[PDB]
Amino acid sequence: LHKEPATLIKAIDGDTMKFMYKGQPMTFRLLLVDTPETKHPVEKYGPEASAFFKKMVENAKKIEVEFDKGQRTDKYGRGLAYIYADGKMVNEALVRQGLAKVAYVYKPNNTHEQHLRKSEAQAKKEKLNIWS
Ligand SMILES: Cc1cn([C@H]2C[C@H](OP(=O)(O)O)[C@@H](COP(=O)(O)O)O2)c(=O)[nH]c1=O
Numbered sequence: 001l002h003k004e005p006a007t008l009i010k011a012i013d014g015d016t017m018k019f020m021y022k023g024q025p026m027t028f029r030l031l032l033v034d035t036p037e038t039k040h041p042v043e044k045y046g047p048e049a050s051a052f053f054k055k056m057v058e059n060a061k062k063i064e065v066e067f068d069k070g071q072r073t074d075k076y077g078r079g080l081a082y083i084y085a086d087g088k089m090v091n092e093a094l095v096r097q098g099l100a101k102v103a104y105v106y107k108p109n110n111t112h113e114q115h116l117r118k119s120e121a122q123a124k125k126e127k128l129n130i131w132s
Protein backbone atom coordinates (compact mmCIF):
# COMPACT_ATOMS: atom_id res chain seq x y z
CA LEU A 1 0.00 0.00 0.00
CA HIS A 2 1.11 3.62 -0.45
CA LYS A 3 0.11 7.01 0.80
CA GLU A 4 -0.86 9.76 -1.73
CA PRO A 5 -1.61 13.40 -1.01
CA ALA A 6 -5.01 14.96 -1.02
CA THR A 7 -6.47 18.30 -0.07
CA LEU A 8 -9.39 18.83 2.21
CA ILE A 9 -12.35 20.60 0.63
CA LYS A 10 -14.99 19.81 3.24
CA ALA A 11 -15.66 17.42 6.16
CA ILE A 12 -19.19 15.90 5.73
CA ASP A 13 -19.71 13.73 8.82
CA GLY A 14 -17.73 11.32 10.95
CA ASP A 15 -16.56 9.17 8.08
CA THR A 16 -17.18 10.99 4.79
CA MET A 17 -15.42 14.00 3.31
CA LYS A 18 -14.88 15.93 0.09
CA PHE A 19 -11.25 16.04 -1.11
CA MET A 20 -9.40 17.48 -4.01
CA TYR A 21 -7.71 14.37 -5.31
CA LYS A 22 -5.42 14.54 -8.36
CA GLY A 23 -7.00 17.87 -9.20
CA GLN A 24 -10.65 16.77 -9.10
CA PRO A 25 -13.12 17.05 -6.24
CA MET A 26 -14.15 13.63 -5.01
CA THR A 27 -16.08 12.28 -2.04
CA PHE A 28 -14.10 9.82 0.13
CA ARG A 29 -15.44 7.40 2.73
CA LEU A 30 -13.20 5.91 5.49
CA LEU A 31 -12.45 2.21 5.07
CA LEU A 32 -13.43 -0.37 7.75
CA VAL A 33 -15.39 1.97 10.09
CA ASP A 34 -18.83 3.32 10.65
CA THR A 35 -19.45 6.55 12.54
CA PRO A 36 -23.01 7.07 13.82
CA GLU A 37 -25.47 8.46 11.32
CA THR A 38 -26.41 12.14 11.26
CA LYS A 39 -27.88 12.50 7.69
CA HIS A 40 -30.12 9.65 6.61
CA PRO A 41 -33.63 9.56 7.94
CA VAL A 42 -29.36 11.16 14.34
CA GLU A 43 -27.71 8.29 16.21
CA LYS A 44 -25.95 8.84 19.59
CA TYR A 45 -22.29 9.97 19.14
CA GLY A 46 -23.00 10.98 15.46
CA PRO A 47 -22.39 14.72 16.12
CA GLU A 48 -19.38 13.86 18.35
CA ALA A 49 -17.84 11.62 15.66
CA SER A 50 -18.51 14.27 13.03
CA ALA A 51 -16.85 16.97 15.16
CA PHE A 52 -13.80 14.79 15.91
CA PHE A 53 -13.27 13.94 12.25
CA LYS A 54 -13.73 17.57 11.15
CA LYS A 55 -11.29 18.89 13.72
CA MET A 56 -8.65 16.27 12.96
CA VAL A 57 -8.72 16.88 9.17
CA GLU A 58 -9.15 20.71 9.30
CA ASN A 59 -6.19 21.15 11.63
CA ALA A 60 -3.77 18.89 9.70
CA LYS A 61 -0.70 20.28 7.87
CA LYS A 62 -0.87 17.34 5.40
CA ILE A 63 -3.69 14.97 4.42
CA GLU A 64 -2.93 11.59 2.69
CA VAL A 65 -5.15 8.86 1.30
CA GLU A 66 -4.08 5.21 1.21
CA PHE A 67 -6.17 2.90 -0.90
CA ASP A 68 -6.35 -0.76 0.05
CA LYS A 69 -5.62 -3.62 -2.32
CA GLY A 70 -9.12 -3.99 -3.92
CA GLN A 71 -11.88 -1.57 -5.04
CA ARG A 72 -10.91 2.03 -4.72
CA THR A 73 -14.45 3.32 -4.93
CA ASP A 74 -17.81 2.16 -3.64
CA LYS A 75 -21.09 1.99 -5.55
CA TYR A 76 -21.80 5.70 -4.74
CA GLY A 77 -18.58 6.74 -6.45
CA ARG A 78 -16.86 7.54 -3.07
CA GLY A 79 -13.16 6.86 -2.80
CA LEU A 80 -12.45 4.14 -0.21
CA ALA A 81 -9.27 4.73 1.77
CA TYR A 82 -7.40 5.02 4.99
CA ILE A 83 -6.97 8.73 5.62
CA TYR A 84 -3.97 10.15 7.48
CA ALA A 85 -3.80 13.58 9.06
CA ASP A 86 -0.10 14.45 9.70
CA GLY A 87 0.70 10.76 9.66
CA LYS A 88 -2.08 9.74 12.07
CA MET A 89 -4.75 7.41 10.65
CA VAL A 90 -8.14 9.06 11.11
CA ASN A 91 -9.93 5.68 10.76
CA GLU A 92 -7.99 4.39 13.83
CA ALA A 93 -8.30 7.66 15.75
CA LEU A 94 -12.12 7.52 15.63
CA VAL A 95 -12.24 3.81 16.59
CA ARG A 96 -9.75 4.38 19.45
CA GLN A 97 -12.15 7.02 20.97
CA GLY A 98 -15.17 4.74 20.71
CA LEU A 99 -16.60 7.17 18.13
CA ALA A 100 -16.68 4.56 15.35
CA LYS A 101 -17.11 0.78 15.18
CA VAL A 102 -15.17 -1.55 12.90
CA ALA A 103 -17.67 -2.18 10.07
CA TYR A 104 -18.15 -2.78 6.33
CA VAL A 105 -15.33 -5.21 6.27
CA TYR A 106 -15.37 -6.15 2.57
CA LYS A 107 -12.46 -8.36 1.39
CA PRO A 108 -9.94 -7.73 -0.11
CA ASN A 109 -9.98 -4.28 1.45
CA ASN A 110 -9.20 -5.41 4.97
CA THR A 111 -5.49 -4.75 5.30
CA HIS A 112 -5.81 -2.71 8.53
CA GLU A 113 -8.65 -4.74 9.97
CA GLN A 114 -6.70 -6.27 12.87
CA HIS A 115 -5.05 -2.99 13.72
CA LEU A 116 -8.46 -1.31 13.89
CA ARG A 117 -10.01 -4.15 15.86
CA LYS A 118 -7.23 -3.82 18.46
CA SER A 119 -8.03 -0.15 18.85
CA GLU A 120 -11.77 -0.96 19.12
CA ALA A 121 -11.11 -3.52 21.82
CA GLN A 122 -9.16 -0.92 23.84
CA ALA A 123 -11.92 1.72 23.41
CA LYS A 124 -14.42 -0.91 24.59
CA LYS A 125 -12.26 -1.93 27.61
CA GLU A 126 -12.00 1.75 28.48
CA LYS A 127 -15.82 2.11 28.17
CA LEU A 128 -15.47 5.12 25.79
CA ASN A 129 -18.39 6.90 24.09
CA ILE A 130 -20.25 4.18 22.10
CA TRP A 131 -18.97 1.61 24.64
CA SER A 132 -19.90 3.62 27.68
C1 LIG B 1 -17.13 1.80 4.09
C2 LIG B 1 -17.85 1.19 2.84
C3 LIG B 1 -19.18 1.50 2.65
N1 LIG B 1 -19.79 0.92 1.56
C4 LIG B 1 -21.18 1.14 1.35
C5 LIG B 1 -21.91 0.09 2.20
C6 LIG B 1 -23.17 0.83 2.55
O1 LIG B 1 -24.06 0.80 1.41
P1 LIG B 1 -25.67 0.95 1.59
O2 LIG B 1 -25.93 2.40 1.78
O3 LIG B 1 -26.21 0.47 0.24
O4 LIG B 1 -26.00 0.13 2.78
C7 LIG B 1 -22.75 2.27 2.67
C8 LIG B 1 -22.33 2.56 4.13
O5 LIG B 1 -21.87 3.90 4.09
P2 LIG B 1 -22.32 5.06 5.09
O6 LIG B 1 -22.04 4.46 6.45
O7 LIG B 1 -21.67 6.34 4.62
O8 LIG B 1 -23.84 5.24 4.88
O9 LIG B 1 -21.59 2.40 1.83
C9 LIG B 1 -19.05 0.11 0.66
O10 LIG B 1 -19.63 -0.42 -0.36
N2 LIG B 1 -17.74 -0.15 0.80
C10 LIG B 1 -17.11 0.35 1.92
O11 LIG B 1 -15.94 0.01 2.06
Ligand SMILES: [Ca+2]
Nearest residue numbers: 015034035036
Ligand atom coordinates in the same frame (compact mmCIF):
# COMPACT_ATOMS: atom_id res chain seq x y z
CA1 LIG C 1 -21.56 6.14 8.76
